[PDB]
Structure formats: structure tokens, C-alpha cells
Amino acid sequence: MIDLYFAPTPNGHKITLFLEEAGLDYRLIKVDLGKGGQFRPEFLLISPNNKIPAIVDHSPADGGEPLSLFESGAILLYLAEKTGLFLSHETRERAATLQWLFWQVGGLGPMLGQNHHFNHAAPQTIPYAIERYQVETQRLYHVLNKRLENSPWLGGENYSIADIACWPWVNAWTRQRIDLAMYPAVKNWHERIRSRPATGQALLKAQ
Amino acid sequence: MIDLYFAPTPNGHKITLFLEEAGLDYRLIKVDLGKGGQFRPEFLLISPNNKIPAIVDHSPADGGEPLSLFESGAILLYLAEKTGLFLSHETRERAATLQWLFWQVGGLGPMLGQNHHFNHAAPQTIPYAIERYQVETQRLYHVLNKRLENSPWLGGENYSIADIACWPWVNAWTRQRIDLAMYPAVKNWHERIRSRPATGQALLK
Numbered sequence: 325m326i327d328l329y330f331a332p333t334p335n336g337h338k339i340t341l342f343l344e345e346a347g348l349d350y351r352l353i354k355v356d357l358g359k360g361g362q363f364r365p366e367f368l369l370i371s372p373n374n375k376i377p378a379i380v381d382h383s384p385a386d387g388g389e390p391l392s393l394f395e396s397g398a399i400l401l402y403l404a405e406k407t408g409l410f411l412s413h414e415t416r417e418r419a420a421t422l423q424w425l426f427w428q429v430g431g432l433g434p435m436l437g438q439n440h441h442f443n444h445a446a447p448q449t450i451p452y453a454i455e456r457y458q459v460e461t462q463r464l465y466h467v468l469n470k471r472l473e474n475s476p477w478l479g480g481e482n483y484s485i486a487d488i489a490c491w492p493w494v495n496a497w498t499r500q501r502i503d504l505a506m507y508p509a510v511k512n513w514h515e516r517i518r519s520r521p522a523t524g525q526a527l528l529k530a531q
Numbered sequence: 532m533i534d535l536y537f538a539p540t541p542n543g544h545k546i547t548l549f550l551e552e553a554g555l556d557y558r559l560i561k562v563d564l565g566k567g568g569q570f571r572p573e574f575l576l577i578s579p580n581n582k583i584p585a586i587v588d589h590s591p592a593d594g595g596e597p598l599s600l601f602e603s604g605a606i607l608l609y610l611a612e613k614t615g616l617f618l619s620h621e622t623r624e625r626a627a628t629l630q631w632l633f634w635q636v637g638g639l640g641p642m643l644g645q646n647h648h649f650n651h652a653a654p655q656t657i658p659y660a661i662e663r664y665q666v667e668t669q670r671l672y673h674v675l676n677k678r679l680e681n682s683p684w685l686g687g688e689n690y691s692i693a694d695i696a697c698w699p700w701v702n703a704w705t706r707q708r709i710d711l712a713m714y715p716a717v718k719n720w721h722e723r724i725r726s727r728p729a730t731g732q733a734l735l736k
């Protein structure tokens with residue numbers, strides 16, 4: 325059994341996507357980010373960075389005590405290694421998959437997140453910052469598009485945790501002042517993943 | 532033989548740290564970020580995100596063609612898996628190590644980088660943005676400090692790629708307007724890593 329500490333956000337959806345694709349049983353535990361649920365002492369023991377997603381794995385491979393883990397990328401990697409699913413063991417595909425996973429964690433997520441912040445959450449309109457993250461958002465979509473023009477999926481011929489990590493952020497394009505049609509390979513890939521049954525199951529759970 | 536495409540930056544130093552700690556032979560290939568070396572077509576083939584670090588591994592495990600890789604975190608993980616060094620195979624320590632490695636890549640690096648930008652590189656002074664990333668930098672140091680109060684190293688009892696990923700960023704604490712003495716466990720950990728012989732070799736280049 326996996327407990328998933330969750331809020332309906334791009335980083336939360338990464339994990340529901342994986343769990344639905346892998347067919348793992350899990351319990352969704354809602355953390356109310358608006359009311360400071362992420363700062364509760366009992367939650368900080370699981371997620372000392374005060375963020376979701378976090379999991380608690382009640383059946384770890386070593387047969388021991390529940391295993392807690394935060395960082396969506398570490399969770400995806402952990403679950404992929406545990407299940408043998410959505411991450412290749414072959415060195416080339418595995419390397420390419422990890423490359424794009426870390427690119428999402430270090431680039432796509434953080435920068436699109438700043439885009440969201442300065443456009444929607446900041447109490448003042450700051451054109452320099454808005455422009456900075458807008459240009460960077462476009463750069464990232466351009467990089468993503470160029471890769472997806474060259475391969476069906478980010479890591480190679482198989483859907484993987486790299487695609488799973490990127491999709492919920494691309495799915496938020498509507499908030500990012502991006503025209504997704506300007507990136508046709510991203511658009512088609514986004515649509516393709518949206519049409520997978522597990523993706524629909526994950527979104528319905530978010531409700 | 533590993534080719535390392537490099538600039539003297541926190542992310543560049545992650546990989547020299549690893550290579551020196553692991554005792555791997557490598558060639559340093561300088562990419563001039565100031566002159567747009569990261570946009571050269573031949574380099575974009577290796578690093579399509581137009582950034583350093585990137586490596587080319589000329590003796591990959593599969594015996595095949597040179598293997599190119601970008602993202603400092605993927606490079607660390609790749610080299611750790613290849614060598615068996617600085618990443619545990621035991622499931623608990625491995626999970627904790629990966630947790631803090633991803634935390635660095637998604638949090639410490641990006642936010643301290645924004646701190647650097649708005650304080651030193653931006654052509655205008657933007658107090659809201661400076662404050663946002665200052666506060667977040669403080670938060671990240673507080674999280675890092677708390678973990679280091681509870682464990683000698685980020686992933687457990689052993690130095691790992693998680694520590695290696697974080698250190699060059701902490702080593703830039705002066706640029707971040709952070710008082711490292713406010714984070715005593717970070718301060719001691721920073722001093723400890725600085726004193727390791729490989730660290731000195733990496734900085735010396």
C-alpha cells in the first residue's frame with residue numbers, strides 16, 4: 325500500500341499518473357496547501373521540505389518499516405525501480421530517460437512555476453520578472469518540442485517517468501501565456517498522454 | 532575517458548567534484564558561456580538544453596557509441612551507477628540520497644540561481660523578487676540545516692552524490708547574502724567537504 329500525500333497541482337498529478345499507469349493500489353491523502361497543512365509537524369516528518377507530493381510506502385522492498393519519500397522526481401524513480409515499470413534497465417534508454425526527468429525537475433517545473441507566480445499570484449505586476457520567465461518558458465517548450473520531434477517519447481520508444489514528470493506541467497500551458505499550437509510535437513504528445521486511460525483515472529481522482 | 536563540458540560554476544563544479552572523488556580520468560572542455568559557446572551547433576547535439584555541465588562517455592557500459600548526457604543530476608546518477616560509488620544500493624539509503632539529490636536539482640539550485648540573478652545580474656533592482664528569493668534561500672538553508680543536524684551526510688552515514696550536488700551551491704553562500712553561521716550544521720558540513728582533498732583538486736581544476 326502506498327499513501328500519497330497530495331494536492332491537485334502539476335507535481336501532485338505526476339504521482340497519480342504513475343500509480344494509475346502502474347496499477348498500484350494507493351490512498352490519496354489531501355494536504356490543504358491553502359490552510360498550511362504542509363506545515364503540520366506530523367507531515368514535516370514525512371516531507372521536511374514542507375511540500376507535496378510525498379509518499380509513504382507500507383510495503384518497501386526490504387520488508388521493513390514504512391518508507392517515506394518526498395520530491396516528485398525521487399518518488400517516480402523509486403517507484404519505477406521498485407516496479408520495474410516506466411524506466412528502462414538498458415543503459416542508453418535509461419540515461420536518456422533520466423536526463424529528461426532531471427531536466428523537468430530542474431528546469432521545466434521551477435521555471436513554469438515562476439511564470440505562474442509572477443502572472444497570477446504576485447501582488448504586483450512586475451514586467452521584468454514576467455518577461456524573464458515568459459522567455460524562459462518559451463525556451464523550455466522549444467527544447468521540449470525539438471526532442472519530441474525526434475522521438476515519440478522523451479526517453480526513447482517507450483513512455484516513461486520522464487514523460488509522466490513533464491505532462492502535468494505542459495497540461496498547465498493554459499496558465500503560462502503559451503500557444504501550445506506553436507509547439508506541434510508537444511501538442512500531439514500532450515494530447516496522446518491525455519488520451520491514455522490512466523491519465524483520465526488520475527484526473528478524476530484529483531476531484 | 533569522460534569528456535566534461537564545463538564552466539566554473541556551481542553546476543560545473545558538481546561534476547569535477549564527483550570525478551575527483553571517484554578517481555576517474557577526464558578531459559575538461561571549457562565552454563565559454565560569456566561568448567555563447569553553449570549555443571554552438573556541435574555542442575547543442577550533446578546538450579540540447581544549451582547548458583553545462585554535459586558529459587560524453589567514450590566507454591559506456593554497453594560497449595557502444597559515445598554516450599552524451601546533460602543535467603548535472605542525471606550525470607551524477609549515471610556516473611554513480613556506472614562506478615558503484617557515492618550512491619548506495621541499499622534501498623533506504625538509496626531512497627534518502629535520491630530524495631536530497633532531487634531536492635537540490637528542483638529547489639536549492641534553481642532558487643539560489645534566481646537569488647544570484649536578481650541580486651547581481653539583473654539590470655534593474657526589483658525588491659519584491661529579491662525578497663522572494665532571499666526568503667526562499669533562507670528556507671532552503673533551514674531545511675538543509677535541519678537534515679544535517681539529524682545525519683552526518685544528506686543520504687545517511689556516507690558521503691554521496693546528494694552532498695556533491697549541494698556543496699558548490701552552498702559554497703556560493705557569499706553571493707547569496709546568507710550568513711552561514713546562522714546554519715551551524717550547514718557550516719560544519721561545508722567546511723568538512725571543503726577540507727576533502729578531492730574538493731581542492733576539483734577547484735584547482
Ligand SMILES: N[C@@H](CCC(=O)N[C@@H](CS)C(=O)NCC(=O)O)C(=O)O
Pocket residue numbers: 331333334335336357362374375376377394395396397429433633634637638
Ligand atoms: N521539487 C518539488 C516541487 C514540489 C512543489 O513545488 N510542491 C508544491 C505544490 S505543486 C507545494 O507543496 N507547495 C507548498 C508550499 O510551497 O508551501 C517536487 O518536484 O516534488
Ligand SMILES: N[C@@H](CCC(=O)N[C@@H](CS)C(=O)NCC(=O)O)C(=O)O
Pocket residue numbers: 333334335429433434435436437438441637
Ligand atoms: N511557495 C510557492 C507556492 C506555489 C507553489 O508551490 N507552486 C508550485 C506549483 S503547484 C511550483 O511552482 N513548483 C515548482 C517546481 O515544481 O519545481 C510559491 O510562492 O511559488
Ligand SMILES: N[C@@H](CCC(=O)N[C@@H](CS)C(=O)NCC(=O)O)C(=O)O
Pocket residue numbers: 427430431538540541542543564569581582583584601602603604636640
Ligand atoms: N539543471 C541544470 C542547470 C545547469 C545550468 O544552469 N547551467 C548553467 C551554468 S551553471 C548554464 O549552462 N547556463 C547557460 C545559459 O543559461 O545560457 C543542471 O543541473 O545541470
Ligand SMILES: N[C@@H](CCC(=O)N[C@@H](CS)C(=O)NCC(=O)O)C(=O)O
Pocket residue numbers: 430540541542636640641642643644645647648
Ligand atoms: N540563463 C541564466 C544564466 C545564468 C545561469 O546559468 N545561472 C545558473 C548558475 S551558473 C543557474 O541559476 N542555474 C539554476 C540551476 O542550477 O537550477 C539566467 O539568466 O539566469
